[PDB]
């Protein structure tokens, strides 16, 4: 299943210089192994994944609390948003590339 608990951003989405972005997320819940709901979208009303995910299928491997996970993403050139989570506690981070 997917991690239905909210995440905390440990650091701001950084630039690697490889045309990709990197952000480290902390998982609050202890729901066991679950998939990380992260995607790159063009707008906040149509979650079309316009950005390829470099880190192949990010995962929360351990079944404990406060597990940090590193995720790498390639956003499209121009305006874009980085969405982490689902529901009302979904955090949207506007990113701009080159």
């Amino acid at each position, epitope marked *: *299943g*997917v991690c*239905s608990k909210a995440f905390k951003f440990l650091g701001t989405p950084a630039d690697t210089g490889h045309g990709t972005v990197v952000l480290e997320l902390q998982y609050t819940g202890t729901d066991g192994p679950c998939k990380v709901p992260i995607s790159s979208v063009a707008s906040l009303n149509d*979650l079309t994944p316009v950005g390829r995910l470099v880190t192949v299928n990010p995962f929360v491997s351990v079944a404990t609390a406060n597990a940090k996970v590193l995720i790498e993403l390639e956003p499209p050139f121009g305006d874009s948003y980085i969405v982490v989570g*689902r*529901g*009302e*506690q*979904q955090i949207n981070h506007h990113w701009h590339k080159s």
Partner: antibody
Amino acid sequence: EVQLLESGGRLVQPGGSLTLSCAASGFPFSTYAMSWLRQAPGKGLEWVSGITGDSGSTYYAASVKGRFTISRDNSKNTLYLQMNSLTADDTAVYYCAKDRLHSGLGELFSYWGQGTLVTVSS
Amino acid sequence: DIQMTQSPSTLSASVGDRVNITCRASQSINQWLAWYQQKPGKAPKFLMYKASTLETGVPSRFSGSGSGTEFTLTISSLQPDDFATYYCQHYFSYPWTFGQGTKVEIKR
């Protein structure tokens, strides 16, 4: 605009089974999470179950885990609630509810149907 | 399981009064609180989320405040269209929980 029509509520004997349906119109049902809720006659509201719309995650109240099952048919815009092992404390009006945001977890309920009446008695 | 508690359970007011309805939580909920309205023989109506943000279409005489563990819904000019029972609901943890409800009654 939005219309949620519940049907399937009736009288069933304790230990029996019953399936609820909820036909939806007026919004992109495929992209919105739905929820079943119940209100006992003259009592407060109670959340029962929710489903993501992508049918990727389901959630149930403690008193219904193992007894109830939530599902949906996106091609028919219909929400389902399979109920088994119905006790007397399951007698309530069961409501159909639409999530506020799309692609959500059913965290809240922005529109309700008129609800259907389920009676568990001998 | 967060338990929601509303106070009072019944208040009697006249058309035009300003009314407060308190809703408290057993744990700390930052602002993940919603408000619902229900008239008798009718389905509930979603009024507010985030404890302060009005749902679209809701009159501006409704307002909310509170954070953490105590919240209040406010009706700044009580209209006949507002006398009903009001429920608060949290969306902090998995088991979404409602309050007891609070019946606003016409005083005569």
